[PDB]
Design a protein around this motif. Structure first.
Motif: not given
Ligand SMILES: NS(=O)(=O)c1ccc(-c2ncc(CCl)[se]2)cc1
Ligand SMILES: [Zn+2]
Length: 257
Positions: A143-145, A150-151, A215-217
């Motif tokens: 899952f991604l939040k 995440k580098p 990130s949102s970006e």
């Protein structure tokens, strides 16, 4: 012609792919209170040190990061699995908004996105034969939040401009999928299916409990992709997720207490 729109989305898929209403369809909701700890599950082994990525492709439904699977170089073993499963590709499913996007849900909670690392059982020789077998595939779901970046994802995000539209691909060598893994390998596991047509009932699902943060970006860049081909009307690649399917006669097992 299947896709994720009003006229060709998941509630329509059964007409071309009747197994859509089958006995072991994916994804499902993971009810954390009803999943049972299974102390006989062996620990999971994720061996990605020699992974060889080749290419990134927009296939009109997602983007796939493809790997050289002609030798045992990036393998999943252990856990609920018998034998050795080789990494072929990863991809994601995501939403139009941070409140949705994942395919599996956890106590009905939807994450912003879900990563699928797709592997095939080497005893069947190739992916095409493997998908005809009930134990043919092992998909690692993460899952991604939205939060910290995440580098290890950024190299992926930054190539997406070059594969905006359906059918575009780009060279994508030396990508290390270890940089997409959370700290813990605690998981849930159940028998299920591909979550896109042909919806074949060939997958051992292994869904990690710990999400990764992006990130949102980063996720905004996923949402600039297109379902359409170049020079067609622009339709943003968003909400490319199948909703939870009935659990039927299945038990979800937990690797942890
Ligand atoms: N979302 S998922 O991880 O369950 C998943 C993985 C792989 C496929 C396919 N790979 C080749 C296919 C025929 Cl071209 Se379909 C479809 C779905
Ligand atoms: Zn998937």
């Amino acid at each position: 012609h299947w896709g994720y729109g009003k006229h060709n989305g998941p509630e329509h898929w059964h007409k071309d792919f009747p197994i859509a209403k089958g006995e072991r369809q994916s994804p499902v909701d993971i009810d954390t209170h009803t999943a049972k700890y299974d102390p006989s599950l062996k620990p999971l082994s994720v061996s990605y040190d020699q992974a060889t990525s080749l290419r990134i492709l927009n296939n009109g439904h997602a983007f796939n990061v493809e790997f050289d699977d002609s030798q045992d170089k990036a393998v999943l073993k252990g856990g609920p699995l018998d034998g050795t499963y080789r990494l072929i590709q990863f991809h994601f499913h995501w939403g139009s908004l941070d409140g949705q996007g994942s395919e599996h849900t956890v106590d009905k909670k939807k994450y912003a996105a879900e990563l699928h690392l797709v592997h095939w059982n080497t005893k069947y020789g190739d992916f095409g034969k493997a998908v005809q077998q009930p134990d043919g595939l092992a998909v690692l779901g993460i899952f991604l939040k939205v939060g910290s970046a995440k580098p290890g994802l950024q190299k992926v995000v930054d190539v997406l401009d070059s594969i905006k539209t359906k059918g575009k691909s780009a060279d994508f060598t030396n990508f290390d999928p270890r940089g997409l893994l959370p700290e813990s390998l605690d998981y849930w596991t159940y028998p299920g299916s591909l979550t896109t047509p042909p919806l074949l009932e060939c997958v051992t699902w292994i869904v990690l409990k710990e999400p990764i943060s992006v990130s949102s970006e980063q996720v905004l860049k996923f949402r600039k992709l297109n379902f359409n081909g170049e020079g067609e009307p622009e339709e943003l690649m968003v909400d490319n997720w199948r909703p939870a399917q009935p659990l039927k006669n299945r038990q979800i097992k937990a690797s942890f207490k």
